[PDB]
Symmetry: C2
Subunit: 106 residues, 2 copies
């Protein structure tokens, strides 16, 4: 199952697909940590984007994010195969802002 | 079956996959024409590339290309799914150079 660990100094964000990523409805779980400590009650946004291509417009999907105790479930529908750019935006409960990027080659 | 017609002024290049494109060995058939006339005995090169991006280093494959009577068969191995950029370079028998580009989602 697809997973990437994103590192930005003291910020680590593991993002893992729940099951294998598919065309259709997808669930990913993100575990953002600062010096290994879970970021709870954070604003977590996850965007999946495909640039414009022959026969299709640029596509942007914002995931629906829910938290349980520092684990964030990001639900999205990926309507087609191909490369999706993944952008993770985090505002901690303390107000610090972080961004991290990866990619999903579906 | 994936299929596209690339138009570049007086150049047209029809390209069609053999079967559905997916990870592994892939075959494409290319039919280049200049003002409707088949381009025979040309040098046809086809590059498949996934650009460098967050979480994936750049990947590049050059297809093995053969001609029979103006039809060019391009064989390549695409080791992962996702979006592949397709670049077609043609040097006609007369010495004219052409370049056309598209992409396909695996
Ligand atoms: Ag798309
Ligand atoms: Ag696409
Ligand atoms: Ag790749
Ligand atoms: Ag990629």
């Amino acid at each position: 199952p697809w997973e990437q660990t994103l590192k930005a100094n003291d910020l680590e964000v593991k993002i893992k697909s729940v099951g294998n990523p598919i065309k259709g409805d997808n669930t990913f779980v993100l575990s953002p940590t600062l010096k290994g400590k879970a970021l709870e009650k954070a604003i977590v946004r996850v965007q999946f984007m495909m640039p414009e291509m022959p026969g299709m417009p640029a596509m942007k999907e914002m995931a629906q994010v829910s938290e349980k105790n520092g684990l964030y479930e990001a639900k999205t529908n990926l309507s087609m195969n191909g490369t999706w750019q993944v952008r993770v935006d985090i505002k901690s409960k303390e107000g610090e802002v972080y961004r991290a990027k990866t990619s999903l080659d579906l």
